Amino acid sequence: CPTDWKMFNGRCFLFNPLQLHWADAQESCMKEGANLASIHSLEESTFVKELTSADLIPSWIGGTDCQVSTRWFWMDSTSMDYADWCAAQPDTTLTECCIQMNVGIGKCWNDTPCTHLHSSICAKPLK
Ligand SMILES: [Ca+2]
């Protein structure tokens, strides 16, 4: 993997501490040939959590159901075969359609307004 990135299951990951809304976070990843990260297993979830410091900082990941409620998509076009929703989540309301991880005391996923500023996780295949 390139310098500051970390490898896991054929992909490289990076924690971007900069506070950005979802769209800016995705744009920031694209500048590096990446996408906000998709997560497909508890093993991957744990690996990414280890990139967010001892505080497990709330972070944007690349999933949303912003087009049609309840229809979730990852920006890297991989399948939605895993989720780590907090209790009662997701709300599926189009007004809070971007996935945020490391949310609350449970450090789980919560769909939230995409305009909120958060750190983020970027990922891209290993070359
Ligand atoms: Ca929510």
Numbering used by the authors: 4 to 130
Task: Paste lines from the article.
Many species of ectothermic animals, plants, and microbes living in cold environments produce antifreeze proteins/polypeptides (AFPs) to protect them from freezing damage. AFPs can also inhibit ice recrystallization, of which the large ice crystals grow with the expense of smaller ones, thus prevent cell damages during freeze-thaw cycles. It is generally accepted that AFPs function through adsorption of their flat ice-binding surfaces onto particular planes of ice crystals and prevent or inhibit further ice growth. Type II AFPs are 14–24 kDa cysteine-rich proteins, which have been found in five fish species, including herring (Clupea harengus), rainbow smelt (Osmerus mordax), Japanese smelt (Hypomesus nipponensis), sea raven (Hemitripterus americanus) and longsnout poacher (Brachyopsis rostratus). They are the largest globular fish AFPs known to date, which are homologous to the C-type (Ca2+-dependent) lectin-like domains (CTLDs). Homology modeling and NMR studies on type II AFPs indicated that these proteins share the same characteristic fold, which includes disulfide bridges, α-helices and β-sheets, as well as a large proportion of coil structure. Both herring and two smelt AFPs depend on Ca2+ for their antifreeze activity, while the functions of sea raven and longsnout poacher AFPs are Ca2+ independent.
To understand the Ca2+-dependent ice-binding mechanism, we have determined the X-ray structure of the Ca2+-dependent type II hAFP at 1.7Å resolution. The crystal structure of hAFP, a first representative member of the Ca2+-dependent type II AFPs, has been determined. hAFP crystallized with six molecules in the asymmetric unit. Each hAFP monomer consists of residues from Cys4 to Lys130. Each monomer comprises two twisted anti-parallel β-sheets with an α-helix on either side. The overall three-dimensional fold of hAFP resembles the long-form CTLDs and is different from other types of AFPs. As expected, all 10 cysteines of hAFP are paired to form disulfide bonds, Cys4-Cys15, Cys32-Cys125, Cys69-Cys100, Cys89-Cys111 and Cys101-Cys117. Remarkably, the additional two disulfide bonds (Cys69-Cys100 and Cys89-Cys111) are located at each end of the Ca2+-binding loop (Gln92-Asp114). The bound Ca2+ is coordinated by Gln92 Oε1, Asp94 Oδ2, Glu99 Oε1, Asn113 Oδ1 and Asp114 O and Oδ1. The pentagonal bipyramidal coordinating sphere for Ca2+ is completed by a water molecule. Considering both the structural data and results of site-directed mutagenesis obtained here, together with the previous mutagenesis study of Ca2+-coordinating residues Asp94 and Glu99, which severely hampered the ice binding, we propose that the ice-binding site of hAFP consists of Asp94, Thr96, Thr98, and Glu99 that form a relatively flat surface to interact with ice.
